[PDB]
Amino acid sequence: KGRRYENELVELLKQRGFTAWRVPLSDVRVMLAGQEHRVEVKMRSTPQAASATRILSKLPFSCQGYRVFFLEALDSQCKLPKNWVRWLNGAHILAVRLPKRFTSPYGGLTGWIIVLPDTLWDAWRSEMS
Amino acid sequence: KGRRYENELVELLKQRGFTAWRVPSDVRVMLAGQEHRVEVKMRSTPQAASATRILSKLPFSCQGYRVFFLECKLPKNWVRWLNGAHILAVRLPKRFTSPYGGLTGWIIVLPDTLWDAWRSEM
């Protein structure tokens, strides 16, 4: 009931070596370079419902100061999807979950798309492997 | 190395039924389902913590905060110690706080808005 995907994202981040946890308030927290960051979690049933249809083939890319990528992707990298700016709602990281059947042909094995500020990309990469 | 008292406060809060932790304002506490930074200060004497005249007054409300032992204006050192956070935890040796009712040595400085959510978590 919504917490399901927040817990899934927390376990996926903890598997990749991140210190992550859940805060009901409906938010997720992550440690990047020794700093706590709020992660907004959105789940949509289809790429159209998440305004990601034209996005999927472009990942990873940088747009309006954000790096947008599939959760497991480490490959080298415009307006941004209007629904996404509203979804950030104060937080700086956004995690969008789609069914894996939609993301997987494009390389998104887990179904998650991470919208992260460009300032945080260096720290995010140095918290894996 | 300063982390000893943050861990002590986290265990004391978890004992009283709070969801508290130290991040790898290093302490976080969950009040009514909301995450709050807790600033931790440890001082060797009541004078070093600007608490000499405070100890006999606890518990009280001053400048919009409820000041009490863990279990009128506020000291100027304390406003600077909050430094952006909204909750402040001051630790003194128990020998100083105990004759006044502070068995643990901790003084909590909590906003009046959070007093209702703090009470209903014990």
Numbering used by the authors:
A (entry chain B): 5 to 29, 39 to 90, 98, 100 to 150
B (entry chain A): 5 to 28, 39 to 85, 98, 100 to 149
From the paper:
The crystal structure of Hjc_15-6 was determined to 2.5 Å resolution using the selenomethionine single-wavelength anomalous dispersion method. The putative active-site residues in the proposed motif E10-SD39–40-EVK53–55, except for residue 39, agree with archaeal Hj-resolving enzymes, as predicted by others. Moreover, this signature is situated within the most conservative part of Hjc_15-6, where the putative active-site residue Glu10 (motif I) is located in α-helix 1, Asp40 (motif II) in β-sheet 2 and Glu53 and Lys55 (motif III) in β-sheet 3. However, Ser39 prior to Asp40 (motif II) is not shown to be part of β-sheet 2. This may be due to the gap between residues 30 and 37, which are not seen in any chain in the two models. The electron-density map of Hjc_15-6 suggested that each monomer has two bound sulfate or phosphate groups with full occupancy. In addition, there are two further sulfate- or phosphate-binding sites in both monomers that have an occupancy of 0.5 and/or have high B values. Based on the observations above, we may conclude that Hjc_15-6 has a typical archaeal endonuclease fold and a dimer organization that resembles those of other archaeal Hj-resolving enzymes.
The enzyme, termed Hjc_15-6, is encoded in the genome of phage Tth15-6, which infects Thermus thermophilus. Amino-acid sequence and structure comparison suggested that the enzyme belongs to a group of enzymes classified as archaeal Holliday junction-resolving enzymes, which are typically divalent metal ion-binding dimers that are able to cleave X-shaped dsDNA–Holliday junctions (Hjs). Holliday junction-resolving enzymes are nucleases that cleave four-way DNA–Holliday junctions (Hjs) into two unconnected DNA duplexes. Activity screening demonstrated that purified recombinant Hjc_15-6 acts as a resolvase, cleaving Holliday-junction oligomers.
